[PDB]
mmCIF file of C-alpha atoms and ligand atoms in Angstrom:
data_model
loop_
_atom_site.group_PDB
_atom_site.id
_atom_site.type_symbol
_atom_site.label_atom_id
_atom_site.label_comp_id
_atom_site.label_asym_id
_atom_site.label_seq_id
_atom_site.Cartn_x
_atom_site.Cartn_y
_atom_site.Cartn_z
ATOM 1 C CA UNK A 1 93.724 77.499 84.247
ATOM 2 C CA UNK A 2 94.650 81.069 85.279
ATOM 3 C CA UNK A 3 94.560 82.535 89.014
ATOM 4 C CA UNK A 4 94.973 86.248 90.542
ATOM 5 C CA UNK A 5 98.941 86.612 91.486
ATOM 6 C CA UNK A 6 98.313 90.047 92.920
ATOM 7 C CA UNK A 7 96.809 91.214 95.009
ATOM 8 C CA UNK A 8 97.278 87.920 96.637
ATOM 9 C CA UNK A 9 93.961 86.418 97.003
ATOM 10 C CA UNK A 10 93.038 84.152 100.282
ATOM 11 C CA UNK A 11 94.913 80.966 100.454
ATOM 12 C CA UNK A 12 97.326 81.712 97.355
ATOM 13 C CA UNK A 13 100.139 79.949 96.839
ATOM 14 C CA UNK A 14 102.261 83.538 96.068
ATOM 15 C CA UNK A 15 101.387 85.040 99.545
ATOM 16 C CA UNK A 16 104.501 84.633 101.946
ATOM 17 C CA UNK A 17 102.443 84.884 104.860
ATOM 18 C CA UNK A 18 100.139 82.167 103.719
ATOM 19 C CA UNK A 19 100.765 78.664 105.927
ATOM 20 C CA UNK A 20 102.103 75.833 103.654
ATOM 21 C CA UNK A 21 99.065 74.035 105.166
ATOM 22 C CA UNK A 22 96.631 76.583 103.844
ATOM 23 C CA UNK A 23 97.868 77.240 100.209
ATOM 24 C CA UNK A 24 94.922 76.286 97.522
ATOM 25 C CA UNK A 25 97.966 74.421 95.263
ATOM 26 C CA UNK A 26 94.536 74.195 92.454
ATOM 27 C CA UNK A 27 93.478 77.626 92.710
ATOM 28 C CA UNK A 28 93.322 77.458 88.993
ATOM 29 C CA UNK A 29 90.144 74.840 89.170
ATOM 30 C CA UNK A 30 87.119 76.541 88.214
ATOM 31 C CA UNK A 31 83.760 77.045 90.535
ATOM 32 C CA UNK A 32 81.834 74.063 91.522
ATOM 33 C CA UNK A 33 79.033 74.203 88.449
ATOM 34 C CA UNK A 34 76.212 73.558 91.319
ATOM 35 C CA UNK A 35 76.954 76.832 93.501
ATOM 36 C CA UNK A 36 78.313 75.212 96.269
ATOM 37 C CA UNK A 37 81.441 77.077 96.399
ATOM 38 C CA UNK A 38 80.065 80.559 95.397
ATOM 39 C CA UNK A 39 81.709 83.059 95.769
ATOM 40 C CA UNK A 40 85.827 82.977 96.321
ATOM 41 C CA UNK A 41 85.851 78.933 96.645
ATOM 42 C CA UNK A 42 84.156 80.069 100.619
ATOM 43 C CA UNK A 43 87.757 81.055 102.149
ATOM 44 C CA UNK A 44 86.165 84.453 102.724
ATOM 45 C CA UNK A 45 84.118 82.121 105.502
ATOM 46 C CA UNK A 46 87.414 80.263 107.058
ATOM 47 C CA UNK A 47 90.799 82.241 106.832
ATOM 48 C CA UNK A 48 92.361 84.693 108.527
ATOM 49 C CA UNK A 49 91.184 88.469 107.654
ATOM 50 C CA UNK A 50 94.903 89.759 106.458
ATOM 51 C CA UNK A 51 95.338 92.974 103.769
ATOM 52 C CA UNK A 52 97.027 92.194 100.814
ATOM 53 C CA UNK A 53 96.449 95.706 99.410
ATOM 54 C CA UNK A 54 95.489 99.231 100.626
ATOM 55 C CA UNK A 55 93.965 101.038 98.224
ATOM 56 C CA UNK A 56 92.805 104.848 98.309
ATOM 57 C CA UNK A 57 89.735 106.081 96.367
ATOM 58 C CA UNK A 58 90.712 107.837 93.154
ATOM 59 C CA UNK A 59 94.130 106.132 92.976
ATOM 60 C CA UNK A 60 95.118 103.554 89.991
ATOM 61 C CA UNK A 61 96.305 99.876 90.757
ATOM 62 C CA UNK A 62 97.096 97.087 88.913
ATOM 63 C CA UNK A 63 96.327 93.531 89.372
ATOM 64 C CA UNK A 64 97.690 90.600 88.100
ATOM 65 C CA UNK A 65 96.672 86.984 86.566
ATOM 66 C CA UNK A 66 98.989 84.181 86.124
ATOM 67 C CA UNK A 67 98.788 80.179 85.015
ATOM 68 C CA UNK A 68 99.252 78.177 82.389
ATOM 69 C CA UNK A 69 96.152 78.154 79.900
ATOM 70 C CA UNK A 70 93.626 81.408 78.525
ATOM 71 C CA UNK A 71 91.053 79.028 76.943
ATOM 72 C CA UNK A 72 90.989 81.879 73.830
ATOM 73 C CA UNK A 73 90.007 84.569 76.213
ATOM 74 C CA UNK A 74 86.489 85.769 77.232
ATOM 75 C CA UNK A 75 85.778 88.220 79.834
ATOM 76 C CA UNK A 76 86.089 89.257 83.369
ATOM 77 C CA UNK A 77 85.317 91.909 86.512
ATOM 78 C CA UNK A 78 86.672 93.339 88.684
ATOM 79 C CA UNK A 79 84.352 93.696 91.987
ATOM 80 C CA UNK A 80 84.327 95.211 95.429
ATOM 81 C CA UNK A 81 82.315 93.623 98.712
ATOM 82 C CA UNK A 82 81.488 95.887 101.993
ATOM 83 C CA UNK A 83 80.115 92.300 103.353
ATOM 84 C CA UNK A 84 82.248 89.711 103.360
ATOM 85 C CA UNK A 85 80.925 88.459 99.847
ATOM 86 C CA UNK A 86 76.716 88.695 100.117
ATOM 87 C CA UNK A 87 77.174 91.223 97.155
ATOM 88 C CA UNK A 88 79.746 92.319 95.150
ATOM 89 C CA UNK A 89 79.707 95.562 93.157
ATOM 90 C CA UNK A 90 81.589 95.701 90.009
ATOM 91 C CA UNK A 91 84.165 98.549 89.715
ATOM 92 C CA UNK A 92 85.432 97.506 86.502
ATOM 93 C CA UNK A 93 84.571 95.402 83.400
ATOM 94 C CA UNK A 94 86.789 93.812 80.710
ATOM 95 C CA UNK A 95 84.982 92.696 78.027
ATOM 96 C CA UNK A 96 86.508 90.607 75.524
ATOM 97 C CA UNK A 97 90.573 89.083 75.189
ATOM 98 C CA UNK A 98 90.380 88.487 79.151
ATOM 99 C CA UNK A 99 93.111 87.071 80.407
ATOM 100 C CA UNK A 100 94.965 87.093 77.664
ATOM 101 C CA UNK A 101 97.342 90.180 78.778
ATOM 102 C CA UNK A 102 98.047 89.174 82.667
ATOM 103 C CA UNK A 103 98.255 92.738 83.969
ATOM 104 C CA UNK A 104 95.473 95.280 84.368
ATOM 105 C CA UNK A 105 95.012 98.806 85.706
ATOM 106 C CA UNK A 106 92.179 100.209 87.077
ATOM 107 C CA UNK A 107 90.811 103.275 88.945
ATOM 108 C CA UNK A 108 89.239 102.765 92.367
ATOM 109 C CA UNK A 109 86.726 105.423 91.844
ATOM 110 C CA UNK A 110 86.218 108.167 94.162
ATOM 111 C CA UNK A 111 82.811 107.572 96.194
ATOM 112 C CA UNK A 112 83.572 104.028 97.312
ATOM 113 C CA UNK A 113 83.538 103.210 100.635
ATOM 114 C CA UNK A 114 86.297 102.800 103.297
ATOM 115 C CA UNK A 115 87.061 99.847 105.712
ATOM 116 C CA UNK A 116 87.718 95.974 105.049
ATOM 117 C CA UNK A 117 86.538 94.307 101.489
ATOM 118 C CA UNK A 118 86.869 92.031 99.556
ATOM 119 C CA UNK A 119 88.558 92.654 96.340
ATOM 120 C CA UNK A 120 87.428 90.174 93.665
ATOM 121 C CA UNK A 121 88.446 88.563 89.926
ATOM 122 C CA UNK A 122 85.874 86.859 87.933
ATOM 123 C CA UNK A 123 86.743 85.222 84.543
ATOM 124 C CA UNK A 124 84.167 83.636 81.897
ATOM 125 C CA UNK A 125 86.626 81.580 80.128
ATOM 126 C CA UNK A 126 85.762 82.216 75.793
ATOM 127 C CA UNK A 127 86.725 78.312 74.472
ATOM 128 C CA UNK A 128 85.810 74.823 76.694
ATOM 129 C CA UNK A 129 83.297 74.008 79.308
ATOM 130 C CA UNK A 130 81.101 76.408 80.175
ATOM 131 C CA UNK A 131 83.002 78.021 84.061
ATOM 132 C CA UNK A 132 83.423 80.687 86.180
ATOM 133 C CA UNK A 133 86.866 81.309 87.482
ATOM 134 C CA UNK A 134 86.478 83.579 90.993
ATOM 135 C CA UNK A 135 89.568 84.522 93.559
ATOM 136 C CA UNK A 136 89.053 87.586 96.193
ATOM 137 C CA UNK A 137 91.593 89.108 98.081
ATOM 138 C CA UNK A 138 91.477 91.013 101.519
ATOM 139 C CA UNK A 139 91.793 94.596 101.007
ATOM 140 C CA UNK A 140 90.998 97.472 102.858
ATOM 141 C CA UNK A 141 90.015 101.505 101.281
ATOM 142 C CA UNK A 142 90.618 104.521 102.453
ATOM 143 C CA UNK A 143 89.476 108.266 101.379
ATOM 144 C CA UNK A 144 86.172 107.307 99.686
ATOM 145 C CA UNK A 145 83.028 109.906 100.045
ATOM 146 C CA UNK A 146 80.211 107.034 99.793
ATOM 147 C CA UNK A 147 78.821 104.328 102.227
ATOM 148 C CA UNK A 148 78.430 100.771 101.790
ATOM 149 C CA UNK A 149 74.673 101.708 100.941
ATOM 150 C CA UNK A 150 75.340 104.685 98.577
ATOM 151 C CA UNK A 151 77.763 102.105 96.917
ATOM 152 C CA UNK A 152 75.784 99.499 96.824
ATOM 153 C CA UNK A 153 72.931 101.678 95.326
ATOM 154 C CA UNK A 154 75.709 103.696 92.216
ATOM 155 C CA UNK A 155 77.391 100.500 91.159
ATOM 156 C CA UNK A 156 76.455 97.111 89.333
ATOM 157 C CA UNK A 157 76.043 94.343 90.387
ATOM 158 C CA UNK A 158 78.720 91.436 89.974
ATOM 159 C CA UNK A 159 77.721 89.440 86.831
ATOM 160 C CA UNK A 160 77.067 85.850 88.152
ATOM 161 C CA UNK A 161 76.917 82.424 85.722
ATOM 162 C CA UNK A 162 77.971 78.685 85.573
ATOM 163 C CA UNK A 163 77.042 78.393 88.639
ATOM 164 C CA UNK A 164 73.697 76.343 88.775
ATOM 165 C CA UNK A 165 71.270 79.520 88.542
ATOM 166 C CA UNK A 166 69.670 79.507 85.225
ATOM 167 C CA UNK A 167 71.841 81.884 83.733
ATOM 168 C CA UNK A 168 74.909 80.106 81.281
ATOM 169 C CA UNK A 169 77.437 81.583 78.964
ATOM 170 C CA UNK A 170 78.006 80.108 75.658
ATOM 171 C CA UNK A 171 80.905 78.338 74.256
ATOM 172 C CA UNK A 172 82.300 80.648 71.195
ATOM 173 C CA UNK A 173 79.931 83.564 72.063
ATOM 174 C CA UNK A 174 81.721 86.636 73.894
ATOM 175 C CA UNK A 175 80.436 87.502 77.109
ATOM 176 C CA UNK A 176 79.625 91.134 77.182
ATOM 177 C CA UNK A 177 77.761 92.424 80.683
ATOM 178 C CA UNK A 178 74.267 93.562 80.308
ATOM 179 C CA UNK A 179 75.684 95.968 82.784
ATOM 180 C CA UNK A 180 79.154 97.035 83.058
ATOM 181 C CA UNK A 181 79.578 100.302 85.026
ATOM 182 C CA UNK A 182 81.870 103.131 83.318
ATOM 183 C CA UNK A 183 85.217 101.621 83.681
ATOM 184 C CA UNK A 184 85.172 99.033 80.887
ATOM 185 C CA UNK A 185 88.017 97.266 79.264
ATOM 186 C CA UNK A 186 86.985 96.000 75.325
ATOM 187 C CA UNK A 187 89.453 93.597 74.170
ATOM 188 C CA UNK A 188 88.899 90.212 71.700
ATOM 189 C CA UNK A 189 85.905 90.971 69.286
ATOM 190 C CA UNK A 190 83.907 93.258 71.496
ATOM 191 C CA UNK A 191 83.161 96.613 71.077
ATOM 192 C CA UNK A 192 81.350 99.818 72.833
ATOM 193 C CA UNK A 193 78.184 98.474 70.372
ATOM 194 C CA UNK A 194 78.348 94.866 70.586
ATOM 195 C CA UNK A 195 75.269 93.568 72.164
ATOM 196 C CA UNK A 196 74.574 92.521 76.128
ATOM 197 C CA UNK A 197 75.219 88.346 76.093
ATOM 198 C CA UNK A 198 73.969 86.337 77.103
ATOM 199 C CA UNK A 199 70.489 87.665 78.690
ATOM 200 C CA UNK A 200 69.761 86.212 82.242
ATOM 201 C CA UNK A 201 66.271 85.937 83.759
HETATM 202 C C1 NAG B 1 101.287 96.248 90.372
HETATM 203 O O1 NAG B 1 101.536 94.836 90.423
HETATM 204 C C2 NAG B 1 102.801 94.382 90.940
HETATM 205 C C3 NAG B 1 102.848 92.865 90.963
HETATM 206 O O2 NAG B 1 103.017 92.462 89.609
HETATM 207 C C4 NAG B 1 102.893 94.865 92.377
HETATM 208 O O3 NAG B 1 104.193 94.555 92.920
HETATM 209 C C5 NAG B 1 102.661 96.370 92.445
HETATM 210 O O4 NAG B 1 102.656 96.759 93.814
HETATM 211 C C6 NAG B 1 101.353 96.804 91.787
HETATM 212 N N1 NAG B 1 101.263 98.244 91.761
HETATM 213 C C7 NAG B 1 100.110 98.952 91.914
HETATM 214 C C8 NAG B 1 100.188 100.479 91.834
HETATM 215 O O5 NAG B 1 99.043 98.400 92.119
#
């Protein structure tokens, strides 16, 4: 039961800007298990496009996660979209004891791309059901050298389970990426040699 308190993702109940109407009050809830709501719960789809942050390539940020239960841990990214959330490209990994600090830095690295994005959290919760946990946030970057293609091409893709496509984490096994990128984050009982898990075909 955790959510992304900054930057303020779409529809969160921390944004000032955000309607009382509109506030997702149970943005902690996990992804529907059959897809349906893949990725950000849709409100990429049906909300106003709005910054929340302005980032500049080669700059370090911080981002924030808030709520009231870690489920032991487990493992998250953090993931960047030139296309309003078709694919996401993961700019950082943290693998292992995720969330249970609720701050993180990371680097936007140099050769991203610049315009509107979409900024997002995943979380593979370690202990209970088998969920994804996803919020994105409106962003837009500034002073990258790449293109949404050169990007799209250099960087991972997001790491995508629980969500009705044949790939499943597994309760009281860490969840370390197959492929991470070279920002990673090791936390909980994973290491720079603990093995990819689980495999997805
Ligand atoms: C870090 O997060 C806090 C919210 O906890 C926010 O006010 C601040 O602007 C962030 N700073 C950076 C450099 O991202």
């Amino acid at each position: 039961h955790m959510e992304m308190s900054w930057p303020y993702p779409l529809r969160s109940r921390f944004d000032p800007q955000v309607p009382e109407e509109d506030i997702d009050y149970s943005m902690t809830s996990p992804l529907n298990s059959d897809g349906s709501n893949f990725p950000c719960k849709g409100y990429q789809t049906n909300t106003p496009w709005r910054a929340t942050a302005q980032y500049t390539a080669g700059q370090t940020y911080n981002m924030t996660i808030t709520g009231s239960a870690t489920h032991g841990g487990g493992s998250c990214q953090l993931s960047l979209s030139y296309d309003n959330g078709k694919t996401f490209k993961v700019i950082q990994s943290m693998e292992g004891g995720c969330p249970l600090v609720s701050k993180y830095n990371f680097k936007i690295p140099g050769d991203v791309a610049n315009g509107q994005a979409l900024f997002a959290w995943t979380w593979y919760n370690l202990i209970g059901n088998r969920e994804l946990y996803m919020n994105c946030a409106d962003v837009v970057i500034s002073g990258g050298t790449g293109t949404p293609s050169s990007f799209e091409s250099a960087y991972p893709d997001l790491f995508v389970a629980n969500v009705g496509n044949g790939c499943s984490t597994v309760e009281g096994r860490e969840t370390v990426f197959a492929n991470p990128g070279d920002q990673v984050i090791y936390g909980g009982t994973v290491t720079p040699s603990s093995p990819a898990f689980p495999i997805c075909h």
